[PDB]
Amino acid sequence: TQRKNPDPYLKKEWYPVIAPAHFKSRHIGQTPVTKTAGLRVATDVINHRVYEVNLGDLNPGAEDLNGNTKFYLQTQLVSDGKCLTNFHGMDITRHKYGSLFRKGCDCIDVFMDIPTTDGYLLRVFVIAFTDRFRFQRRKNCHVKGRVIRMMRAGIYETLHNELGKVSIPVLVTKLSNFEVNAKLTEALQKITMCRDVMIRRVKVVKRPRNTMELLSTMHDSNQV
Amino acid sequence: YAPENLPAKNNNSEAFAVCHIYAGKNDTFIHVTDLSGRETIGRVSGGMKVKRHCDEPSAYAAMQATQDLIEIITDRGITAVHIKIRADGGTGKRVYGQGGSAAIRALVRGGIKIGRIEDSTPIPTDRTRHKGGRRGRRL
Amino acid sequence: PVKRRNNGRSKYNCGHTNIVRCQNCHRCVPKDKVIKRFTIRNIVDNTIADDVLNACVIQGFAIPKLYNKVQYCVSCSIHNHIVRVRSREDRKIRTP
RNA sequence: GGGACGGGUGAAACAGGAUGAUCCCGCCGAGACCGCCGGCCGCGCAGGCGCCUGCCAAGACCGCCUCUGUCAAUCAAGGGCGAAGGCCGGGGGCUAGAAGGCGAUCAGACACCACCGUAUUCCCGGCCGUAAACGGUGCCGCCCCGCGGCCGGCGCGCGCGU
Ligand SMILES: CC[C@H]1CN2CCc3cc(OC)c(OC)cc3[C@@H]2C[C@@H]1C[C@H]1NCCc2cc(OC)c(OC)cc21
Ligand SMILES: [Mg+2]
Ligand SMILES: [Mg+2]
Ligand SMILES: [Mg+2]
Ligand SMILES: [Mg+2]
Ligand SMILES: [Mg+2]
Ligand SMILES: [Zn+2]
C-alpha cells in the first residue's frame, strides 16, 4: 500500500530571522517555507514562530557568564523579506539548575506576578540557596524559620522595587545584564549567607493583541 | 535543487540547524529540524537498517542511519547543527541508550560542525503512578 | 534472632515515611530503607569529548554534565553488586 | 511539517500505521500529584505529617525572688480517635489496576513476562474498628562508668567567632 511522492524541497525558499537591537549579533538564522499556493501564504504561516537562542551567541564574548542563559523570540511581523521578533520569555539551562543543588543546604523558590506598562503580564521565578559561614563549627548549613521568612520578604520587596513596573525594552536590558541578580544578592547577603541567587525563568501570561509600535521600538538601535 | 531552494550563503556565519536524538531502550531516532521545530529536513531511525528487533537500538544501526541522514542534509544545504539528546523520560529510566554516543561520533566524523549541547529529557515536578505494582516486575 | 540494631533502616523519631519506587523494577520502598547514590557524568563519553570539542565552533565551550540520583531496592542492589554481603564483624563498618 | 515503519521482550507475538502512524513544534481540556533540597533533622496521644498566599484556634520546651496550696498516680465499667482494603448514599473519570479477556513460556500454566481493561484509587456525609497497629520491650518515680554527634532555649568568657 506504499506510494512515492515528489520531493517537497523543490518548492521551498528560505527567509532570514532578525533579533532586537539590545544584542550585538542580530542574525538568528534562516527558516524554510513552502511557496505560496492556494490560500497558503508563506508570510502568514511563518508569522508566529518561536526561536530558542543562547545568550552567548547573541552577545559574543563572556562565555562563562552568558552560556547558561537562553531566551526565545517570537516573530510578529514579516517585512522586506525578513522576519522581526520580540521578547517571549527567558530561561536557564538544565545542567546549571542541576548543579545548583547540594545536600546540607536549604532551597528557596519564589514566584510573583509582575505587570508592565505595555500591557504584558509576566510571572518570574527566583531561586536561592544558603551557604556556610567562614568559621562555622558544624557541617550542615540549615537555618531557622524567621531567617527564611525574612529572606522571602526581602526577595518580594526587591522584585517589587526594581521590576514593579517597567517597559519591555528596559526589562530585556536588565535581564541581558545581571543587575537584578546583583540587587537580590546584596539585599539577601545582608541577612545571611547566600550561595547562589538568580532568576530561573520569565513567563509571559497575557499580552495585547496588537504590538506594532512596540516592535518598531525594539528593532531600532538608537531609541534604546 | 535550484539555488533558491537552498539556504543563502554569506560570510558572516554558516547554516545552523538542530538535531534531536532519541536514545531509547528499544529504538533510536535521529531528526533534523530548523531553528524552530515546525519544519523537518531529515528523519532517520535505527529500525530501517536492521532485520532483528533486538538490534534496533544498537550503535551500528545508529551509525548507518546517521551517515544516510548527513548525506541527505548535506545535499539539502546544512553544515552545522545544535544537539538535543534525550531519553524516554516521563517517570521512566532517565538514562541514555547505547545509540546516542554512536550517533554523535558519526555526526562528528561526517564533517559536521557542532554548536551547543543540552539535555531534553522530559522530567516532572510531580509523578503519576508508574506501572508494575507495588511488588514490581518479579520475573 | 535480631540481625541489625537499626532493623535494616534509618528511622528515628517518627512513625511513617514517604515511599519511593525502585528505578529498575518499580517496587515501592520506604524512603529510609532505599539505597541512594549520586552520580555526576558527562553527556558525551570521555573517549570522544576531544573530538566534539574540536568540532565545536564556539570558543571556550565546556561540556555539560548530568546530575542524577539513583535509588534501588535491596534485591536489585545485591543482584547488581551495588552492595555486598559482609561478615558478621564487618557489618558494623560504616565508612565508604 | 515529513514520508515507512512503530511498540514491546531474555527473544518474540497479540493491539497501532498511505484514512500519513512513530518523530518535531504550538495551542486546548480534565483530573491526579508536590520531585532533586529530603537528613542516626523535626512535629504529633498514636494512626500519621512536604506547592504559593492568607485566616482560625492550639501545643511542648526554656527563662522567672508571678499565683494557688495536695488539687496527685494508675485503672474494670463507660466515652473518643484509629493505616490500607471494604460497605451505604451522592459527585467526579487521569494515571495505575483486583475480576475478566488476549499473546507468549511450559508436559500442563487457568501463574510468574507482554498488552487491553471494570470495581477501586480522588472529594462530601456516614458505617466498619481491624494490621509484623514492632522498640515483637505497659504507665509513674529514684540511683547509676566513660567518650561522642545532632536539635531547641538560656547563661558565662574572651582576642567577637554563628
Ligand atoms: C517468567 C517468564 C519465564 C519465561 N521464559 C523461558 C524461556 C527463557 C529462556 C531464556 O534464555 C535466554 C531466558 O533468559 C533470560 C529467559 C526465559 C524466560 C524465563 C522466565 C522465568 C523467569 N523466572 C525464573 C528465572 C528467570 C531468569 C531470567 O533471566 C534474567 C529471566 O529473564 C527475564 C526470567 C526468569
Ligand atoms: Mg529474581
Ligand atoms: Mg534468619
Ligand atoms: Mg508503623
Ligand atoms: Mg480508604
Ligand atoms: Mg503487641
Ligand atoms: Zn532499580
Residue C43 forms contact with B (CB below 8 Å): yes
Method: cryo-EM
Nearest to A31 among B4, B13, B34 (CB): B34
Question: What does the buried/exposed string (b/e) look like for A23-57 if buried means 16 or more CB atoms within 10 Å of the residue's CB?
Answer: beeeebbbbbbbeeeeeeebeeebeebebbbbbbb
Q: Which ligand is nearest to the CA of C15?
A: 4
* Cell numbers given for A173: 536590558
Dihedral of alpha carbons B88, B94, B99, B103, sign: positive
Q: Which of A97, A150, A154 is nearest to A127 (CA)?
A: A97
Q: Check whether residue B125 has its CB closer than 7 Å to nucleic acid strand D.
A: yes
Q: What residues of chain C lie within 8 A of the CB of A64, using their CB? A: 60
Structural domain boundaries, residue C49: 1-96
Reported structure resolution in angstroms: 2.9
Q: Output the CA–CA distances (angstroms, integers) from residue C88 to A123, B77, B130, C8, C96, in the order listed.
A: 58, 68, 38, 14, 17
> In total, how many domains does chain C have?
1
Q: Determine the residue of chain C that is closest to B86 in CA distance.
A: C43
Pick out the nucleotide with least CA–C1' distance to A97: D36
List the C74 CA – D98 C1' distance (angstroms): 27
Task: Evaluate whether residue B48 is within a structural domain.
Answer: yes
Interface list for A 100-129 with C (CB within 8 A): 101
Q: Output the CA–CA distances (angstroms, integers) from residue C26 to B26, B61, B133, C21, in the order listed.
A: 19, 30, 7, 5
Q: Which of C34, C2, C5 is nearest to C17 (CA)?
A: C34
CA–CA separation, C89 vs C96, rounded Å? Answer: 16
Would you say how long chain C is, in residues? 96
Task: Evaluate whether residue B120 is within a structural domain.
Answer: yes
Residue A60 forms contact with B (CB below 8 Å): no
CA–CA separation, C61 vs A218, rounded Å? Answer: 30
A156 forms beta bridges with: none
> In total, how many domains does chain B have?
1
Q: Determine the residue of chain B that is closest to A31 in CA distance.
A: B34
From the number of C-beta atoms within 10 Å of its C-beta (0-12, 13-18, 19+), residue B111 rates as: exposed
List the A151 CA – D41 C1' distance (angstroms): 21
Q: What residues of chain C lie within 8 A of the CB of B109, using their CB? A: 51
Pick out the nucleotide with least CA–C1' distance to C69: D36
CA–CA separation, A23 vs A219, rounded Å? Answer: 10
Q: Check whether residue B1 has its CB closer than 7 Å to nucleic acid strand D.
A: no
CA–CA separation, A204 vs A207, rounded Å? Answer: 7
Residue C60 forms contact with B (CB below 8 Å): no
Would you say how long chain A is, in residues? 224
Q: What residues of chain B lie within 8 A of the CB of A47, using their CB? A: none
List the C2 CA – D74 C1' distance (angstroms): 33
CA–CA separation, A114 vs A84, rounded Å? Answer: 25
CA–CA separation, C42 vs B16, rounded Å? Answer: 24
Would you say how long chain B is, in residues? 139
Task: Evaluate whether residue B6 is within a structural domain.
Answer: no
The whole-angstrom distance between A95's CA and the closest CA on chain C is 6
Supply the Cα-derived Rg of chain B in whole angstroms.
Answer: 17
Q: Check whether residue A142 has its CB closer than 7 Å to nucleic acid strand D.
A: yes
Question: Which H helix or E strand runs over B26?
Answer: none
Phi, then psi, of B60 in degrees rounded to 5: -60, -50
Q: Output the CA–CA distances (angstroms, integers) from residue C49 to A142, B46, B54, C45, C62, in the order listed.
A: 38, 24, 28, 6, 10
B80-86 and B16-23 beta bridge pairing? parallel
